[PDB]
Design an enzyme around this catalytic site. Sequence first.
Site, PDB file in Angstrom:
ATOM      1  N   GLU A  36      -3.271   7.899  12.780  1.00 51.57           N
ATOM      2  CA  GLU A  36      -2.379   6.785  12.513  1.00 51.57           C
ATOM      3  C   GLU A  36      -1.495   6.529  13.727  1.00 51.57           C
ATOM      4  O   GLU A  36      -1.257   7.424  14.537  1.00 51.57           O
ATOM      5  CB  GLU A  36      -1.548   7.087  11.263  1.00 51.57           C
ATOM      6  CG  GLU A  36      -0.578   6.004  10.767  1.00 51.57           C
ATOM      7  CD  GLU A  36      -1.216   4.638  10.549  1.00 51.57           C
ATOM      8  OE1 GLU A  36      -1.357   3.863  11.518  1.00 51.57           O
ATOM      9  OE2 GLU A  36      -1.552   4.317   9.392  1.00 51.57           O
ATOM     10  N   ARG A  37      -1.066   5.276  13.887  1.00 48.69           N
ATOM     11  CA  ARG A  37      -0.066   4.957  14.890  1.00 48.69           C
ATOM     12  C   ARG A  37       1.242   5.656  14.564  1.00 48.69           C
ATOM     13  O   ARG A  37       1.582   5.872  13.402  1.00 48.69           O
ATOM     14  CB  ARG A  37       0.178   3.458  14.958  1.00 48.69           C
ATOM     15  CG  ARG A  37      -1.010   2.580  14.716  1.00 48.69           C
ATOM     16  CD  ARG A  37      -0.519   1.219  14.288  1.00 48.69           C
ATOM     17  NE  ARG A  37      -1.519   0.168  14.393  1.00 48.69           N
ATOM     18  CZ  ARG A  37      -2.464  -0.067  13.494  1.00 48.69           C
ATOM     19  NH1 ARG A  37      -2.553   0.678  12.410  1.00 48.69           N
ATOM     20  NH2 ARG A  37      -3.317  -1.058  13.675  1.00 48.69           N
ATOM     21  N   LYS A  81       0.823  -1.199   0.000  1.00 49.59           N
ATOM     22  CA  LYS A  81       0.000   0.000   0.000  1.00 49.59           C
ATOM     23  C   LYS A  81       0.858   1.249   0.000  1.00 49.59           C
ATOM     24  O   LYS A  81       0.577   2.190  -0.738  1.00 49.59           O
ATOM     25  CB  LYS A  81      -0.925  -0.022   1.208  1.00 49.59           C
ATOM     26  CG  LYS A  81      -1.788   1.187   1.381  1.00 49.59           C
ATOM     27  CD  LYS A  81      -2.694   0.974   2.565  1.00 49.59           C
ATOM     28  CE  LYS A  81      -3.558   2.170   2.824  1.00 49.59           C
ATOM     29  NZ  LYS A  81      -2.736   3.298   3.309  1.00 49.59           N
TER      30      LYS A  81
END
Lengths: 141, 538, 50
Positions: free
Chosen positions: B179-180, B153
């Site tokens: 997001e992390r 991705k």
Amino acid sequence: MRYTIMVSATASDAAPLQFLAPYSGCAMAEYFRDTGKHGLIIYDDLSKQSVAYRQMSLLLRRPPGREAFPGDVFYLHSRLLERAAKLSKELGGGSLTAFPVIETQAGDVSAYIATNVISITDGQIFLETELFYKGIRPALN
Amino acid sequence: AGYVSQVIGPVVDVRFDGELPSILSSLEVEGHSVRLVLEVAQHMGDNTVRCIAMDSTDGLVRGQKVVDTGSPIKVPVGRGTLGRIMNVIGEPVDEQGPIDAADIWSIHREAPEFTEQSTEQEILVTGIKVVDLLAPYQRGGKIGLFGGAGVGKTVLIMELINNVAKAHGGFSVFAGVGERTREGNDLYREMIESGVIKLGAERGNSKCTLVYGQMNEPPGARARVALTGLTVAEYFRDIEGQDVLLFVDNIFRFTQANSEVSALLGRIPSAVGYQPTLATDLGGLQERITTTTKGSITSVQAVYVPADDLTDPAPATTFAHLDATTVLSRSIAELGIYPAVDPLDSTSRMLNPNVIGAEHYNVARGVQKVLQDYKNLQDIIAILGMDELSEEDKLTVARARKIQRFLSQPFQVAEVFTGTPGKYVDLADTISGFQGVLTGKYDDLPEMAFYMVGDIKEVKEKADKMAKDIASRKEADNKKVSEELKDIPSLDKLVSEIKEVVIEEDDGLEEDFKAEALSSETVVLNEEGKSVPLPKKN
Amino acid sequence: EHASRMSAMENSTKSAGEMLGKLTLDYNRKRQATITTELIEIIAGASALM
């Protein structure tokens, strides 16, 4: 025990203590993360910490959301779990590795706190109770 | 000019004795550890505004001075933000100095009105074969990316960034909504490694502005960071006149963050558990992604589907806005095909002959029908036999087996670790290439001729090299000398070459340690405010 | 007989997949309705106190 701290907020303890035990244990393990060494934090039953925080927030009459939980119950666990990092070489290179433990009810990962921690963490280790009595121990799906 | 009255979690009430700030206006809490920005959510009456914080509210006192900035959250925009990382309120979190602001724009904005919209509905050529042919991208449309982990991705993200900057000269914004931080740092270093983000003096040649609102940020900060990425993209659209790419990483986390800030402001949740304003809180973001008369914003939004349930209201509300899906599959990636776009589950609204023409439409539908025809006989090949059925059925097997190879393509940002040079493929070359494989002009070329190549005049050179490779095999032999004593020693020699590392039983840990002494007595403040023991009578 | 059974259990997995898909859709409806109704119960309990 030469290397292990235990932070134990038991069932008879107050709900704010069960809420604050993962944060206090993470503060104890961030000493090893921040000074170059390596940590391993295990929040056993983050489900029960979530239930304790829901107790305090319904009793403070904060507006309840799904299943009874507050709005910031995701922010609770993400703010806790993002302190498990591997630091850069100009910060000592230390690290902290979290193993949150989430109990499911009849094995659904569609429960609210289980979906929250699945969204937060990197991987998962899903232990299946059907594999447990087939002899496969650890019952890792 | 205003002072803090209530602090309930991330939700702060501020009281103004003068005039109130507007809703969505930004307020600065004067005097705090870090910069604490609040955003006005409602006017509660009795000269109180209700605000939602963009940082932690721990350490906040009722009566703390709060300065109204007179505007919403204002972020630096321009070419000086390229290759930088911003948080929601515009601060640089990449630790590389300040941000060279061309302008300072409000993140809150109405959608481009009806007279400004484009009625053209044209295709965004992306240089990727499977994306340009089967699931084209609308210039100005929203594209759902159903990828995940290990399907390539991030390579597809960086290649859309690379190919759009290379072809159309537009810049990209990546909005990492929730997001992390490990994944966000991985994407940052992978963008530095692939050359789409450059550090130092070459910073102007970066193609991407990262806008990161991390997962440990409060729900108000995760709910607004997509608008910050939108504002950075709207500057490039409206001032620079470009075809911008916006990447809203996990649009579902945008939905979930706005649901959290709607739950915290005491609103009754709607269906399944979501905010009552779910369609309008999503449409306020998605309607600013459009084509204006100046330029466009094309949005590639990763979509998470909550319980593998497409009728859940967050993906059912998102899918109303989407113009294409590109489903990245693990089974496509385990045939070594890259990019891992599922050629049959990816859809596009741009796939009808009134926007792409009957030539492109019929080539795409023929390719999709041929791959479908191969797909529903693999339980007939694996059960009854490979050469069991007809030759025409094995003709579709061979044609779809080489079209399924031909959708793969080497990527230009992947060449720094794969060696194979990436190949931008144009649209008319893609149409003329897949039409030839569909009619059968390349039924004689091998299946590995159609693998990791740009266009149709490279599968020929691939087969030409593969048939020069027949004559390069009689140059040598195959053998492995000295069956037991080439380099394999006695096992005592192998343990007497490994070097012993130093292990000590003094673990240490008192290296730069304060060792304060903690009092066992409880120490409180008296009415004057000084540290005093507890008065020992209830 | 063996080939007729191979063609007969081919339609049985087709039927047990389309029945499964209908049942999965109806389960998703019941899951969504369960979360909504429990949420409406919780909100009505809290609003009768505040």
